[PDB]
Design a binder for this molecule. Structure first.
Ligand SMILES: [Ca+2]
Length: 223
């Protein structure tokens, strides 16, 4: 996250870190046994880390649970990043409390102008590299589809939205991918892609979760 603020420990209780020896992507806890992330974060050998603030220090609220199954969306396209969404089943259910909690799926899609919260452990610089150890947060609005398509001609599908600031300076970045975009208490987006981070006229692009609720629910019900 570039241009954000330190969230505070366990203030984003649905945020997960995906770990394969190191943090590589975020995700969101949607019930006691399932996480949603970005398909481009797929790899074998995932450990899901819940209850994290500092990802390099054991602070006492963590739960570390291995994945038993990963399911990339049937229509994910790695070249265009269309349908950039993946479900991960945990080997055992997490223990839910005030510091480790699920986030609700949306019943309706959010409109442009709605303010959302984006969070992650990704790079905090638009030029160069500095990775934080504690969770960072950013408040940002959903942009109109017309502004999004004007920023990224030929690249925005109906399964994507832009959020952020056309002036630049505040955005998600590398290492935030897979993490949550929460608006009015519901999961509306997944951190997916952008051109650099925090550049003028290049806001972040997010997977539009409301288009996937039926797939999510049916997949969980049968796996
Ligand atoms: Ca920790």
């Amino acid at each position: 996250i570039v241009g954000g603020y330190t969230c505070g420990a366990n203030t984003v209780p649905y945020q997960v870190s995906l770990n394969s020896g190191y943090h590589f992507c975020g995700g969101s806890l949607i019930n006691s046994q399932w996480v949603v992330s970005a398909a481009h974060c797929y790899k074998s050998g995932i450990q899901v880390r819940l209850g994290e603030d500092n990802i390099n220090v054991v602070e006492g609220n963590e739960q570390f649970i291995s994945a038993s199954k990963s399911i990339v969306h049937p229509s994910y396209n790695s070249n265009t990043l269309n349908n950039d969404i993946m479900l991960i089943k945990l080997k055992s259910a997490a223990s839910l409390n005030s510091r480790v909690a699920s986030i609700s799926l949306p019943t309706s899609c959010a409109s442009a102008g709605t303010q959302c919260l984006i969070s992650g452990w990704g790079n905090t610089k638009s030029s160069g590299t500095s990775y934080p150890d504690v969770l960072k947060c950013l408040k940002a609005p959903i942009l109109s589809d017309s502004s999004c398509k004007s920023a990224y001609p030929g690249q925005i599908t109906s399964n994507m939205f832009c959020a952020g600031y056309l002036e630049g300076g505040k955005d998600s970045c590398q290492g935030d991918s897979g993490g949550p975009v929460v608006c009015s208490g519901k999961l509306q987006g997944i951190v997916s892609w952008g051109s650099g981070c925090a550049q003028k006229n290049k806001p972040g692009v997010y997977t539009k979760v409301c288009n996937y609720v039926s797939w999510i629910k049916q997949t969980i019900a049968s796996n």
